[PDB]
Amino acid sequence: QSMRLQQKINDLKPYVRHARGPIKAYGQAALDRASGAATSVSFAELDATHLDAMVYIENQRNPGLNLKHFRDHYYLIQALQSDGPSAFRAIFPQTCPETGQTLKHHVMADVRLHAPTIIITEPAVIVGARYQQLQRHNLTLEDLSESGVPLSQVAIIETQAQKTSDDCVMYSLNYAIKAHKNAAQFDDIHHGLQHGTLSTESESRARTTLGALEASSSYSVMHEGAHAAFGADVLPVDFYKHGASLTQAYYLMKRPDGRMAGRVNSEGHSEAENLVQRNQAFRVKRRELLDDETPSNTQFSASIDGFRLQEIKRVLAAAQ
């Protein structure tokens, strides 16, 4: 139990207790989730359902965010083929190549239009348990490619900040907001991608699961052309504020460039905070078995859940 997440709970509880409809049920499930109680439902589906009502209030909160929710990844392609905004971000679930069904596992795409440039951010890992995320990313990339977009101008960035299999959509959302807040660096990455290159990819692609597989297999496992890199080398510290792993926070603050060793809360704070401190401020035990107790601290940062509570408070306050 942690005072910060508890504070977030106390902030949200009235809004849910005053809510009506499916959003009350969702908010209650989120409160249970955060509090450390059991959740008799999958949160990928819940988040997927109530993503739009958020996206709206977040687009209000930060004009210029340009966040969109696409039911398919083909709707992303349809959206690309328009003289729309010069820069927009989209959240979408992957599609199973052998069934054509959407399978949760959402990702976010920071997009610039011009020969368009696409940046897919992976909250978890590129490869996956049974090489599933890999071939799914492959489907997405192939479709983007026959859409007309050159694969040398698309980049998937594995962050490995998310350690759970449930919080895809919230990580995607926070990553959208942060991609808007950190527009400059993304503009840099896009200027790079326009000429078909990615900064320090040579070192940074190895640090991903995709890198280990490409080095252990020595044959193309992900599509020829598509770029990839580890988040800590190309993204700002904002993308790791919700990393569950404290070891990750430690290893990130220990980086020589010291990009991840700064302060991670707004400067308008009496008490400063860095990555590790924030991780420790949202540090709670986790929810699996007693027979299968795990090595390393069984604990993690439930900061992302607090992000969920945050979004729900914003929506429920926005509606009333």
Ligand SMILES: CC(C)(COP(=O)(O)OP(=O)(O)OC[C@H]1O[C@@H](n2cnc3c(N)ncnc32)[C@H](O)[C@@H]1OP(=O)(O)O)[C@@H](O)C(=O)NCCC(=O)NCCS
């Ligand atoms: C990343 C992964 C492959 C294992 O890498 P790993 O993190 O080296 O495995 P570890 O056993 O060392 O996990 C250690 C970290 O996981 C964190 N963790 C917290 N909740 C977790 C969870 N539900 N599942 C896995 N790891 C979790 C632990 O806190 C620890 O961080 P700490 O040492 O700071 O506490 C694995 O955790 C994972 O994400 N698997 C899912 C990937 C996948 O197939 N699909 C994802 C798409 S949803």
Ligand SMILES: O=P(O)(O)O[C@H]1[C@@H](OP(=O)(O)O)[C@@H](OP(=O)(O)O)[C@@H](OP(=O)(O)O)[C@@H](OP(=O)(O)O)[C@H]1OP(=O)(O)O
């Ligand atoms: O995710 P965002 O939409 O970008 O919201 C962020 C942020 O959230 P993150 O933890 O996900 O990075 C902080 O909230 P905390 O969880 O750290 O407490 C912050 O607040 P502080 O920096 O002062 O701590 C503030 O939230 P709020 O809107 O409630 O003020 C802020 O969004 P803003 O751009 O509105 O400041």
